[PDB]
Amino acid sequence: THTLLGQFFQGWGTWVASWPLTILVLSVIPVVALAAGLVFTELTTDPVELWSAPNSQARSEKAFHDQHFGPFFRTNQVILTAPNRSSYRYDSLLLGPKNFSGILDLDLLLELLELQERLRHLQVWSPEAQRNISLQDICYAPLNPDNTSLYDCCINSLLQYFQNNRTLLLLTANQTLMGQTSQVDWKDHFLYCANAPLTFKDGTALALSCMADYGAPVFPFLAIGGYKGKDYSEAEALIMTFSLNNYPAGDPRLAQAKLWEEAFLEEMRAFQRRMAGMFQVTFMAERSLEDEINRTTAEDLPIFATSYIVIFLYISLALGSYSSWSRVMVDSKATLGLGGVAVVLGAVMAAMGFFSYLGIRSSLVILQVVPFLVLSVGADNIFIFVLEYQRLPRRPGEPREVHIGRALGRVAPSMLLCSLSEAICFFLGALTPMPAVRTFALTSGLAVILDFLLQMSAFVALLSLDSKRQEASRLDVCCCVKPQELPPPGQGEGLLLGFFQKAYAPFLLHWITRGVVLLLFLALFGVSLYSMCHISVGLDQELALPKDSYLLDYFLFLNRYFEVGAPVYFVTTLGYNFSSEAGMNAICSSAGCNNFSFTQKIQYATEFPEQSYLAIPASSWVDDFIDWLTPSSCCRLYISGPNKDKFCPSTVNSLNCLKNCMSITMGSVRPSVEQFHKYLPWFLNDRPNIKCPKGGLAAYSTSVNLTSDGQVLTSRFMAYHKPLKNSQDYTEALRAARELAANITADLRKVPGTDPAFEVFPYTITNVFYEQYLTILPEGLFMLSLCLVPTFAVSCLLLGLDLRSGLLNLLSIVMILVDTVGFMALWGISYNAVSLINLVSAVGMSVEFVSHITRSFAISTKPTWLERAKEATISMGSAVFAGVAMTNLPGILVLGLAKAQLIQIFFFRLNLLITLLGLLHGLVFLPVILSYVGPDVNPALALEQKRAEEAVA
Amino acid sequence: THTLLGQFFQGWGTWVASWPLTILVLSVIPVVALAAGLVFTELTTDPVELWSAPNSQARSEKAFHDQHFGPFFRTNQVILTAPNRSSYRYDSLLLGPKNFSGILDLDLLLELLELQERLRHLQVWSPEAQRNISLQDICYAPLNPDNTSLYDCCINSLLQYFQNNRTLLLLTANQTLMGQTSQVDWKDHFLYCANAPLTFKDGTALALSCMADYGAPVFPFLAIGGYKGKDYSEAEALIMTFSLNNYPAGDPRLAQAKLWEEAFLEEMRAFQRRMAGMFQVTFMAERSLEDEINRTTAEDLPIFATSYIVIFLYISLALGSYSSWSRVMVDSKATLGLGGVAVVLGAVMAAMGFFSYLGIRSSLVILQVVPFLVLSVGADNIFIFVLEYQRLPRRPGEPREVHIGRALGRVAPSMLLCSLSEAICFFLGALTPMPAVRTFALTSGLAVILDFLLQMSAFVALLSLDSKRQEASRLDVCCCVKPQELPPPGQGEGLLLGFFQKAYAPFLLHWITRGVVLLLFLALFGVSLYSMCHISVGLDQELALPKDSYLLDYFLFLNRYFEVGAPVYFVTTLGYNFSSEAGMNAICSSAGCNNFSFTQKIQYATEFPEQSYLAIPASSWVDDFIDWLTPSSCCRLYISGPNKDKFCPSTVNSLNCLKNCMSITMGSVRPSVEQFHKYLPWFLNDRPNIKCPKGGLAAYSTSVNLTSDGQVLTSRFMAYHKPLKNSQDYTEALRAARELAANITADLRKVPGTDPAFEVFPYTITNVFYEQYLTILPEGLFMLSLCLVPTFAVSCLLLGLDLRSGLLNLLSIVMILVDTVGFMALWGISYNAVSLINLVSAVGMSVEFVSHITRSFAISTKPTWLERAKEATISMGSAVFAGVAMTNLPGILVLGLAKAQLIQIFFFRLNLLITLLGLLHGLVFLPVILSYVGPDVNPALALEQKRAEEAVA
Numbered sequence A, B: 001t002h003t004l005l006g007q008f009f010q011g012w013g014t015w016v017a018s019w020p021l022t023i024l025v026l027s028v029i030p031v032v033a034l035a036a037g038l039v040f041t042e043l044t045t046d047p048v049e050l051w052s053a054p055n056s057q058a059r060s061e062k063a064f065h066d067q068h069f070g071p072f073f074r075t076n077q078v079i080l081t082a083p084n085r086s087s088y089r090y091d092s093l094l095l096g097p098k099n100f101s102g103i104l105d106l107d108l109l110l111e112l113l114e115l116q117e118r119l120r121h122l123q124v125w126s127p128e129a130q131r132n133i134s135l136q137d138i139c140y141a142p143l144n145p146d147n148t149s150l151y152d153c154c155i156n157s158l159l160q161y162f163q164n165n166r167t168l169l170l171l172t173a174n175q176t177l178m179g180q181t182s183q184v185d186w187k188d189h190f191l192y193c194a195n196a197p198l199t200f201k202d203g204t205a206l207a208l209s210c211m212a213d214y215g216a217p218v219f220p221f222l223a224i225g226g227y228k229g230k231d232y233s234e235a236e237a238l239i240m241t242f243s244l245n246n247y248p249a250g251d252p253r254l255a256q257a258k259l260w261e262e263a264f265l266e267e268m269r270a271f272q273r274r275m276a277g278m279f280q281v282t283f284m285a286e287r288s289l290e291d292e293i294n295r296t297t298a299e300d301l302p303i304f305a306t307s308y309i310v311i312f313l314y315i316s317l318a319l320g321s322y323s324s325w326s327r328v329m330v331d332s333k334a335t336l337g338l339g340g341v342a343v344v345l346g347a348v349m350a351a352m353g354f355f356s357y358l359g360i361r362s363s364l365v366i367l368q369v370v371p372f373l374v375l376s377v378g379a380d381n382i383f384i385f386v387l388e389y390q391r392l393p394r395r396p397g398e399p400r401e402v403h404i405g406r407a408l409g410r411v412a413p414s415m416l417l418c419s420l421s422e423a424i425c426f427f428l429g430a431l432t433p434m435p436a437v438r439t440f441a442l443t444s445g446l447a448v449i450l451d452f453l454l455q456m457s458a459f460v461a462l463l464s465l466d467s468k469r470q471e472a473s474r475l476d477v478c479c480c481v482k483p484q485e486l487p488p489p490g491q492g493e494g495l496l497l498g499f500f501q502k503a504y505a506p507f508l509l510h511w512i513t514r515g516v517v518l519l520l521f522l523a524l525f526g527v528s529l530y531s532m533c534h535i536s537v538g539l540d541q542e543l544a545l546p547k548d549s550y551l552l553d554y555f556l557f558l559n560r561y562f563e564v565g566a567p568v569y570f571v572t573t574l575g576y577n578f579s580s581e582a583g584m585n586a587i588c589s590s591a592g593c594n595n596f597s598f599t600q601k602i603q604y605a606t607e608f609p610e611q612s613y614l615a616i617p618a619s620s621w622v623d624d625f626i627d628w629l630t631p632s633s634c635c636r637l638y639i640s641g642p643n644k645d646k647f648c649p650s651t652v653n654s655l656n657c658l659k660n661c662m663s664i665t666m667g668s669v670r671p672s673v674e675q676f677h678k679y680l681p682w683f684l685n686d687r688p689n690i691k692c693p694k695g696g697l698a699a700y701s702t703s704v705n706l707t708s709d710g711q712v713l714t715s716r717f718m719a720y721h722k723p724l725k726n727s728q729d730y731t732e733a734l735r736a737a738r739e740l741a742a743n744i745t746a747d748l749r750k751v752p753g754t755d756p757a758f759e760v761f762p763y764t765i766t767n768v769f770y771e772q773y774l775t776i777l778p779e780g781l782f783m784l785s786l787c788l789v790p791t792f793a794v795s796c797l798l799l800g801l802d803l804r805s806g807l808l809n810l811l812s813i814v815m816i817l818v819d820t821v822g823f824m825a826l827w828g829i830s831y832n833a834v835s836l837i838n839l840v841s842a843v844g845m846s847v848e849f850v851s852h853i854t855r856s857f858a859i860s861t862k863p864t865w866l867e868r869a870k871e872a873t874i875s876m877g878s879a880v881f882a883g884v885a886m887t888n889l890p891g892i893l894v895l896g897l898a899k900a901q902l903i904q905i906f907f908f909r910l911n912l913l914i915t916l917l918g919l920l921h922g923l924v925f926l927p928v929i930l931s932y933v934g935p936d937v938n939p940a941l942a943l944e945q946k947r948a949e950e951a952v953a
């Protein structure tokens, strides 16, 4: 079959080389026709569309939550710090002596208030709507979602304990406690506020409302950070959150939100530049990450394009035999250099163009990796082809077309194998759930296919033309000048083969050396296979940003100073009869309720924050419901008048509704079905007031989805994760949450009237991204195995290699792959979808190092093993080194300047490791193991290649 | 260049034939990969999407009308007739003696009422909505568009003059007129109703309301037909119109309408079958045409597929040399037959599949024409190739691969030319504005391209395999049997070439004959060029339906019995100040108004219905407005009460609104701006009553588009075309309408305050389809010229023919094209987009008849012209006949059984004319004119072909 592939491609080659210009045109036309599709290019920017499997479990849970409770609100945080403010001890006289941190001075808070106020009235032009968009237009309103004003928006900060008032900030009073009088400043109100945030009266000789301005209580962990326990006075960082309403991707209100985000960021930059010796401000925005990941894609693309020039120059200098110093301008192959560069460029542009035509949207990874990775991969074929064509002695009375045909006939099977291996590996790597990596893998696959299809026709035609110009004895590049005069005839023995045959093969295959490299490589494999255990699964968050971003400093401050992570929502699906007694009983935490209930289980889970990643208990609407219906004059019906048995609000103080909400209470308050269905809309729409603090409008406004009938479809329970720092922490948090939710569902399903398809799932904002790393190692190992099977299967058929050769091929690919993973874990590169696609690219690439040497050893006729190993290395080792290694290095070493830590960490470093291990193995380890336990050569492998050359002449 | 093309394709051929199986697989894989896209096939059915240019003027006018006044209402007509009812003379005594037609008997009308009533309450299941859809859900409501009941729908019929009442139908009274008493039946009320349809009291001793049931007046021309003038009593056909509200393509209400249409059609079929000796009923529906054009596409596709079997058998029998009668099962080329059929089938399926993948929607024409037209066109290449390969004597010591290579090298340029000519012509024919013909032309173009690309590789590989089986001396088709025993060696001289050389060339190129055929063809061209003048431009309407359709009988009855065609809407665009005095003055018809105004001009235009296709004057809202504000107690304001100066309706008879609508009137009633803006919404929403008949709600409800401000955006004026029968009539009607509208706009623009972009355009329902035929002859002639230029230009470069040869080629193509148009006009085939694309296909095809003979004469070496003409004909005439003609006939003669008059008229007949003229010209006229004034042969055309054969051996 190998001989038939040789004959086939020889026939094709000798045809194409006979008709160069026509086939050049016939190959250029479709390339331009496909490359024309780059005007249809659309870049996806949102991390949700890039780093999420669309049909995954977390996405289904997100879609459900988004449908039943609206989308998760956007958050625009600002974290301050006092760098050079030590402390000042102060006694409140009612909580004892307290050491107030430097950041909680008066002037610093007045400056924060000034900033907050200036940020409330801040507006954008909004050139779409042509009107000034104020905060009230788009801001998240937990209370009063309609008729929203600048005093009705979700602005969480320490200055919410004074409702954003300068007079209440500068307010002092005199309090006599057990005979001794002292001054009560804002400090005592803050100290009282931090311990119990849901109080309408302070009660420390100051009638100050601890409740927030917008009218829903602010928790201490949302306004201050850096403390440990309940020593809030020692808070090291103030926090300020301008929460905004989120919309689907179609709504222009989202574009208006993004514009307000941009103006917020601008104001925050101005404030950061203003305060130098006072504050150390860091900020973010919902659009910040999307803008930061896609900033460097354009700023660093021109710097990468120089790799093409470096490879052009290298190819031009590494194929031209300069052995006269008078005809260097006749032998330097600049035409083939331009050819090779134009071929790769055509291939990558055609691939991108074709994928743009189908309306498949590109990304940062595609534009920044594909043109250079495909360039590193797709020059080696041509390089080996030209080197073989140069090394072939032309038979007497043979035209150059048949000579080029014969050269292509010799090195076609190896090139086809390498191309097919790379293509297959990329198209199998494309089974990743991440759309970004999927698109990237498919692009690289098609690019390699088109590259090979161009290398077969376009480059062969151009080599035929270049060779024709050589035969006419005309200038190296500028053929128009023609022969200078009478260049002396050129014949050489090769400098590469010279150096190799003199130095390398004698030194490498020395009796002493072979043992040294064999024990060294066995030891290296052993160390690698040990060091594999110290791997870190999961792509990091801040490591996908540029190294000069402000989000780095923000995430530093977040991970350092914050006290609770993202809020988890234990969303209860439909098919639960909450109108029952046992239904409400099994969600309850208070007395007169069953043991180990929903909220009791969450309350118990949050006891050990290490083993279960919840640092705050669940805020349950049903417990606060049964607490609201307690006869404490919260809910009241009219004893007389036109509105008989209708809810009089807690705010009215008239006698006309002195009737309690429900009947006599001796045990536990449990409403009947009618009571439940009647009182639930009254609970959910009762704003909390001074007369009684319980109310559904504060926290549980949109936490229960009610139909027009009055039945509860679905309800969500709010809990806060502990501060999550690493990708491991978040993965462990998701896993622990899911486990707890499943455990809770197991107890909820046993209640009578529960639909068996009823489920509780712990939804968060960062569940869509970090859920893959639960099940990435099995998928990864399966994919690498499914890539290593067909590579070897096809390598043992295309080349026609013996079992011993194919087995050593597979062993070499396994050894390099394990070594790569070992050094990956050793460097400090994590394992994820990007590392996975690069390891699959490594499986695809390693054949270019192994197969050529293996084949060159297989097809031999030297008497003993050592002479075969010697000649095989010299014949191919030289070709494989000069081609593969020195075309891989220029295209990859440029990605070291990426400035986007994602690329610079996961592409440059990993591909460098793969290329150097490829070189080491395929040049040092393979010749020695082939010299030792290589296959037994038979004459009927080389004497069958002559029936293929003259027969198809 | 011809010699280089020969060498190129020789090299390709000798390569492919050396690797048959691999290239067969490599050519089959993409064909199946593209053919797999047939599961994405979507058929367009609506004539609006098939037979309309989307970006045309009429479509822009339609889109505007649809936006500003809603879409044009659907109409479901029913036309009755009394076949065997002579007459009965009857005197009303108030209109004199009248001859009542047989159809206006009592019982027939009672049966029509019964049908109408049964059709009102008729409902569909509607499996989408799962509820019984009644008429009132979707029916067109001119009065009271909301709260619609079965007594609030637009049901125009003769029984609207009695409000669909049995008692009023059977009502008689006694009237004494000038002393003499007589019986007054329904007949006198009908006679009074027909003359003046807008009367609320009859006034012939019967207090019967002549007004319709729904409450808008029914015109005599909408309820009765067959009369001529104002002799309505002699009506020969009753009419019944269930007008339905139209919706855009997205609305499910359209699907509900279509379901009601289907149930209406079912009921009407039941009624037609019921009444045999009483009525002769024909009906239609808005969905009827869409359902009738796309009925035969599936019922007649299997009958067409037999053409493939006929061509398979013909090819199998016409390539196998049977000259032993013992090895007929060794020489009959069944493998090549299956090959050729599989090639064409692959090509057409790949084309359809590729065009289905891009989401381009197919049609009836594609599925019913493409597979068979492409089959007729795309077998000739292969046929000529095999015939040349068979006729070539194999050189001693030459392998079969080089022999097949040489054969392909000989007949590649001609095949490439023919393919390129056909492709170019189809891709230029694709510039038609009709999307159906565009898609068809593009499909045929791509099909021909892929066919040629398959013929180059797949068929050459299969011929190499078939030839290999022949060399091994194995059975014709079932190669598994192998040689029967010892078949005697086969060598022959050809029966075709035998018959040709013995009979044809001596008889044709006889000294006497040549003059006869030359004068005959000159006379034929002359007659054709004369008969071209008697052409009929425009595709007919009913000729696109099957010959067994009910719509044929319906259109017969419509064209026979109807009195007014479709209603024209003189839509006035925005930028007109109707609130002015001169604004209302220039639209007025009544006294106190300017001469030659809008409606006066329409009223004058409808005087001569022949020269201007309007048979009814315009119903103007402004004239009826200024008539409504006349002090005749139609509009009245409250003299006192809470509703001071507010419109009291005409229906109230109280004293509280005795104040007239406007001030004192001595000259002409002309409202001021305030009066206009205040009274216009009162006019448009005043239902007509007995007290005064004028009112805007009757006819002008949706005839004026008013904004929330009160300004008139746009307004439309209703006029009726005269009965339009032919495509010519409709074209002439559109042209006359457009001309009149432009003339009216010329006078309207001169009024002060008119925006210069103000336009009046006469919109109708059938304006979108029949508007092309205004400007189809220039487009057609331009397209044929733009197709004849590059054909000749490429024919003079690819073949390398001399000027004399190329000129005779162009002359022959022009002569056949003129002859085709002559015979087209003579048969009775109209000229349109379908005839145009077929004539462009003829321009593309005719090269297959002309070029081969021309080339075969050009490349010769016989001493005198006559011997060259003789040998050229025999060498190629035989090849061209046997291939082109006898592969064109089987694929085309099957379309004669189309049963869809569109295909059977425009494809079968036209392609038959083209094929027979192609045969006649390319076999009789071309050899004789080449024998007379052919080019002077030079030896350096045949002695340059030997430097190409052994050189590339």
Ligand SMILES: *[C@H]1O[C@H](CO)[C@@H](O)[C@H](O)[C@H]1NC(C)=O
Residues within 6 Å of the ligand: A123, A131, A132
């Ligand atoms: C909106 O805000 C900008 C702030 O500079 C101001 O100039 C502008 O006048 C404001 N426009 C409106 C419409 O309020």
Ligand SMILES: *[C@H]1O[C@H](CO)[C@@H](O)[C@H](O)[C@H]1NC(C)=O
Residues within 6 Å of the ligand: B123, B131, B132
């Ligand atoms: C609708 O009409 C059909 C006529 O047969 C009748 O059977 C059915 O009961 C009707 N359904 C309703 C919902 O009125």
